[PDB]
C-alpha cells in the first residue's frame, strides 16, 4: 500500500509551506533510518540534498535522476506519514555508507557495553 | 565580549527558548557555528528514545536529533549532562543511523 521510507531511499518532500522557501519543486532527501523504525513511528531520519555543491566537508556526491549532493551534517527527523514522502530512487551503497560514516564523527560514542 | 561555545555534553538553552543536549565536538561547534543536538521536553511518556536527565529542573528526545545554528540563534549554557546520559542518547541514535548497525539491514 502506502510507501514507507527505508534506508537509502532518495525521497522528495515538500518545502514546509510555513518557512518561506522561494525554491521551486520539492526538497530531495536521503533516508538514513531503517524501515522498521520508519514504519513503526511514521518518522524517519534523513539528510537533505542540494543541487549546488560548494565544497563543504560533509557534502556527499550522489551519482546516478537529478544531480545532487547530500548534506550529511544536516540530519533531521521527517514526519513522512503526516507530511508525505515520495520515493524517486535509491542512492549507491557507497554513498549511503559515506553519509553515515561522516555523521559518526558528530555522534561518536564510547566503546563499552551498556543498556540502550 | 566572547560568546559561549557549546562543548560536547553541554545542556544549552536556544532561542527557537528550548533546551537541547549538544552531541557534536567542540572543534566542530566552534568552527562551523553549528552543532548536532537533541531537544529536551518537560515530561516523559515512556517513549523508547527518551532519555531522562537527572534529576531536577529534562527529558531528551534522541530520535529528534537536529543540526542547529547555535551561534546565530544565541545559545546559553545551562550545564553539562552526565557521561552516562550522553552515552545513552548517542547509543540510541547509533541504533538508527550508525555505520556499525547499517550492515545488519543492508
Amino acid at each position: 500500500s502506502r510507501y514507507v521510507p527505508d534506508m537509502g531511499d532518495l525521497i522528495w518532500v515538500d518545502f514546509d509551506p510555513t518557512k518561506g522557501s522561494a525554491q521551486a519543486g520539492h526538497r530531495p532527501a536521503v533516508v538514513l533510518s531503517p524501515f522498521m523504525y520508519n514504519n513503526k513511528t511514521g518518522m524517519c531520519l534523513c539528510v537533505p540534498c542540494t543541487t549546488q555543491s560548494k565544497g563543504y566537508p560533509f557534502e556527499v556526491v550522489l551519482s546516478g535522476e537529478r544531480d545532487g549532493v547530500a548534506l550529511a551534517d544536516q540530519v533531521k527527523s521527517i514526519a513522512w506519514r503526516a507530511r508525505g514522502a515520495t520515493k524517486k530512487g535509491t542512492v549507491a551503497p557507497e554513498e549511503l555508507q559515506l553519509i553515515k560514516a561522516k555523521i559518526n564523527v558528530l555522534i561518536g560514542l564510547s566503546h563499552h557495553h551498556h543498556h540502550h | 565580549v566572547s560568546r559561549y561555545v557549546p562543548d560536547m555534553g553541554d545542556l544549552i538553552w536556544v532561542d527557537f527558548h528550548r533546551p537541547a543536549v549538544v552531541l557534536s565536538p567542540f572543534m566542530y561547534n566552534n568552527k562551523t557555528g553549528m552543532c548536532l543536538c537533541v531537544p529536551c521536553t518537560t515530561q516523559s511518556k515512556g517513549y523508547p528514545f527518551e532519555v531522562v536527565l537527572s534529576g531536577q529542573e529534562g527529558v531528551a528526545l534522541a530520535d529528534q536529533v537536529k543540526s542547529i545554528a547555535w551561534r546565530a540563534r544565541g545559545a546559553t549554557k545551562k550545564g553539562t549532562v552526565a557521561p552516562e546520559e550522553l552515552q545513552l542518547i548517542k547509543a540510541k541514535i547509533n541504533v538508527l543511523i550508525g555505520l556499525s548497525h547499517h550492515h545488519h539491514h543492508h
Binding site: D16, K19, M43, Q74 | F16, R18, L61, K66, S67, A72
Partner: peptide
C-alpha cells in the same frame, strides 16, 4: 511528543 519545531531556519541550517 510533538515533532519539535525550531521555527525559521537560521544561518547555515537548510531546513
Amino acid at each position: 511528543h510533538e515533532n519539535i519545531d525550531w521555527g525559521e531556519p537560521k544561518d547555515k541550517e537548510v531546513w
